[PDB]
Amino acid sequence: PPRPSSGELWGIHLMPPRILVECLLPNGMIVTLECLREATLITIKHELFKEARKYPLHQLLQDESSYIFVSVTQEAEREEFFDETRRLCDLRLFQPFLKVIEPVGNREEKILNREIGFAIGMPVCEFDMVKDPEVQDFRRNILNVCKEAVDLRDLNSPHSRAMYVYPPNVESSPELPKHIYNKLDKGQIIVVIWVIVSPNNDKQKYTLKINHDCVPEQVIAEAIRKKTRSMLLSSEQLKLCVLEYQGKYILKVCGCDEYFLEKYPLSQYKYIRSCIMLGRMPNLMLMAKESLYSQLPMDCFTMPSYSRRSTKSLWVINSALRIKILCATYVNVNIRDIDKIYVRTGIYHGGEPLCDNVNTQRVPCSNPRWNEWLNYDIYIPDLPRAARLCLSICSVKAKEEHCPLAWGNINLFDYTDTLVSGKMALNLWPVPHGLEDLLNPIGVTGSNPNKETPCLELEFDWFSSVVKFPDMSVIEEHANWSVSRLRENDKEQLKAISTRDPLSEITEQEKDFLWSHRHYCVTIPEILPKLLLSVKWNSRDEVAQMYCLVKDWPPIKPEQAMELLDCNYPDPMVRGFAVRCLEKYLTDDKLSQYLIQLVQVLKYEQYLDNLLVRFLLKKALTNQRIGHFFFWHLKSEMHNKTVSQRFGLLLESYCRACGMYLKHLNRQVEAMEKLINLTDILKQEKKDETQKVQMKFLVEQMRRPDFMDALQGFLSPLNPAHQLGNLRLEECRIMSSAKRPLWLNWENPDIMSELLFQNNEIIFKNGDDLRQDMLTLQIIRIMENIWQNQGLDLRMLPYGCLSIGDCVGLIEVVRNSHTIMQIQCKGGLKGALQFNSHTLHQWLKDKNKGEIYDAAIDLFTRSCAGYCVATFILGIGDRHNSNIMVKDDGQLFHIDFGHFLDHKKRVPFVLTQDFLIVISKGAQECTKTREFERFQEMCYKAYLAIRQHANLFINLFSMMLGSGMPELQSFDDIAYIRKTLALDKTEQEALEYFMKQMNDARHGG
């Protein structure tokens, strides 16, 4: 359970109120200074040089002001403490000592690098030491993307700066569907505008009725128009004060930090699109623009120090590919249980071997040396640019049994387009849990930095000079060379192939049929992924001809372009075409929606500097909403050494250009660090102590001032629009789970917090891998968005969930909700030691007396139908009553998906009798009423609605294969959704397949 810092000193959680500090002067004297834990370095340095006069050779000391302190942190960094305002206890010192030096270098740069280091979790100076030129080129070469973004958002200040920090939270289309429009009063919406008056921050409201598509300035116009009703103003005097207010005020959502800064139709803002959907009252606060811009302090971007300061072609090499395997090291194998070991290799383009695999001879465990030149059945000019060498060390053990010991992947071309040559040595990675394939072509390319790990040495051919991949100039001419060496019934088959999902079987006849009609394929651009898998990538003739087709390919929409960023499309031209589709068709709304997968496919990228990372980094620096989660998704995987460098460098550039938001992120990071350290203490030290002893350590530890100052007054990582003010310590507690997560509750400090939620409570859990719940909850939100746009008002509850690191993260609490097991226990036993099945319906009636009863039943039946379909499709059906929840409102939702995936290592979905009571409004033989009749009609429509978008989901899961989640290690894992969605069958066959599952879901019918 490592940590950037487990405490204020090595092996110590907190410093005593007073400790001794060893101070090393610029003369060789060592002075023991007793100082307070909270003493600022300014106080330390002053009292040190005040005490130094009692020690020899004081004559040699310059004036106090000419020195700073330097020490060693718990990250092993020699840190120069330029920012002398910090408390001794915040330095993360390894040992309590301070070395006095003269400052050198740029102060402001050193103070800023320290702040970045705390943000990304590792010292920036570690990047300075990296030998790899690709790393140093990256650090310098994306600083222009930073400059572009900073210049672009500082262009029309302060508005452009406000649009960066408070970007409009809007749906991707103003065209609201009819089932939403029908909740409008003859095409209009009623909204209430609030204003604060100073003498006591008293407030007044103004109710308006307006067209749903009014722009915010038109809303301000109707509000000032309604208040000047009786002022007897001329048409032009009314204009003058409308103009005054339109340009002087903006609108804010009461209770959180969302603003209406751009002229989208009012109903396109998500807050109001849902107020219509939910039928609630949109509450807006009129606010002065000069007040909003006041809380946007100007923030610069300075280039860092590192920013500033013959060959032949591959297609001339007349020889086949060969690679030398020399020897291995640090191979951990039992010499008496394992017979022999050998090295397995293969040349890959994505996941398809370009040629048959070849192995070294088998060799005794005690002497891992081969010195074999392995020959590959591929002509060097036939190598594609994205070709990779995948290898591993394998053991053999009476039928044989082969197993991998360690793996490693290598790009045959580096980021400069050159072909590797000379002797090479790379440390291999551990084989992931559950993987039994002898090779791992999806794993990252690179050497393992961990020490004393198996190191394999190789050698590549040297062809008298440096070899480079041919420029695009000659590639197109080779296509003109090879190409020299309509139809009807074929038209319907080509289109018949575009319909088939990304994982559908594509036989040899079908793929070379595509390659034959590759020129007609640009009439159905959706076919591009299928056609690309049809190219024989070990033929420079076909690849060159293909490069010319993608150069002129019609843009496909992002939902399809994202497939070309998964691990089956590594060619830089293909991936560059996919990026260009995103940066011109992907809205910030659906960028932020699919951000999880877009960050994940960065792992598949062959090199650090690529078109995709520059696109995401560009967008993250021009939209602080997606830049927030961009940072946290990258941060959450810093521990993983397979990407800690790629993501670290990427985070460095973001934090160096995100502006003043870095200050806010560091308050979040410090808040999480304090929580993860307290839970570690509760999980490692006082795990044996009682639950009340733990509670008293919590209540006492949280009351400490340094803790409250850090956990009070910061933004919620689940949604930075939510401010977290003071703690309601009365409501905080440890929970029942063994990992004992923290139930935390903050006040909402918003001026009008009462109009949204007056207190905000979140669960912090340390010890559970939460990224399974993230992906599941995200996927549920996708399905809900699909249903809503089709007109199915099936209400799901994709509550907030965010992983911030290795098995640690936050979960949003749903207020006024209970589990079905909790509700069963509120009733009584009807049968012989059997809970009353009607207890759920009776509880729901008691919570919804009167005319609101029908609404609760409608909401339960709709939310239930949604989760029945969703959980079946995703294989999340067989849940326990304690993992299903329902609000007093009647809204039903499932929880704890990671627990279910773990508990795995029989029913299509949970449609218990208790639910049928509610759905049928408490009837006998409830499966034969007309409420149930139209309930299973909702399920049918919802099922085929997701099947109609099956491609999107299959692509979303495909992009998560490199994540490291054991549920997603191979495309075979994704086959399950092809089964539930019955993609190799027709609609009616899939419909009947789901109908049979539903008959089995009600446990007989």
């Binding site: 092993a76 039992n334 039928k399 086959a975």
Partner: protein, 272 residues
């Protein structure tokens, strides 16, 4: 000469299952299923070539068979055996292997003794018990393997911090001697032993503390050396358990062959 009884016809088998059967096999290994489309009389052949599992569709018309528009053969057994005798380069020069190696459904049926039903009801429960136990040991190993792995890098960075602290205390010693040498030499001839012993008393305290952190470093390098070795032991133990775990998992799997002798899964339902 029937297809249902042929070696290389497996029936309702999934694509993911045949991928699990041509894994790392030689070029020419082949196998046919009824197409995943689940449509009667429609099949697919898959053969290993170039480290890939290349699927081809067997078209069917007027009772004839084949896998191209011109269609000829009477039965799939005639279609296959023709390409077992000579190469399918006739169809496409791009791939030119013969259907060399068949993989059959009821060979590798490695149950040898008197086929009493206890070969299932007893020896299956035995192997499955032996499988879940060894699978539980490997999961336990991988847990303390990752635990030891993280505690190691925690120590590797802690000794690396000790290296920086010691580097900083050693430069303090080398600057103590640089700037005190000639004050000692000056105090020596002034006869001021008092001031010489203030400097020495402080120097002694400097390298007295550097001795404490030097000792603290080796005491940690010792813990690291010993935990790094027990880490390599956990690694070779897992590498020894993996092939065994696969061996008796396949044995447990194929001992459902003799459950398939009854077909209806009564004889495992009894163990449920």
């Amino acid at each position: 000469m029937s297809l249902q009884d042929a070696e290389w016809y497996w029936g309702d088998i999934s694509r993911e299952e045949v991928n699990e059967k041509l894994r790392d096999t030689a070029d020419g290994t082949f196998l046919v299923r009824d197409a995943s489309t689940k449509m009667h009389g429609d099949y697919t052949l898959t053969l290993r070539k170039g480290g890939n599992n290349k699927l081809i569709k067997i078209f069917h018309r007027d009772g004839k068979y084949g896998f191209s528009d011109p269609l000829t053969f009477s039965s799939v057994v005639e279609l296959i055996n023709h390409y077992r005798n000579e190469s399918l380069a006739q169809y496409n020069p791009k791939l030119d292997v013969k259907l060399l190696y068949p993989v059959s459904k009821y060979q590798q049926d490695q149950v040898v003794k008197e086929d009493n039903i206890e070969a299932v009801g007893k020896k299956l429960h035995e192997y499955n018990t032996q499988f879940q136990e060894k699978s539980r040991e490997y999961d336990r190993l991988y847990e303390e393997y990752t635990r030891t792995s993280q505690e190691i890098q925690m120590k590797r960075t802690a000794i690396e911090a000790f290296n920086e602290t010691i580097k900083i205390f050693e430069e303090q010693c080398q600057t103590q001697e640089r700037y005190s040498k000639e004050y000692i030499e000056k105090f020596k001839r002034e006869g001021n032993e008092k001031e010489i012993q203030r400097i020495m008393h402080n120097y002694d305290k400097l390298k007295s503390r550097i001795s404490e952190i030097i000792d603290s470093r080796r005491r940690l390098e010792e813990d690291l050396k010993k935990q790094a070795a027990e880490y390599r032991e956990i690694d070779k133990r897992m590498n020894s358990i993996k092939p065994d775990l696969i061996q008796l998992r396949k044995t447990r799997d194929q001992y459902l062959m003799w459950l398939t002798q009854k077909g209806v899964r009564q004889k495992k339902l009894n163990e449920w």
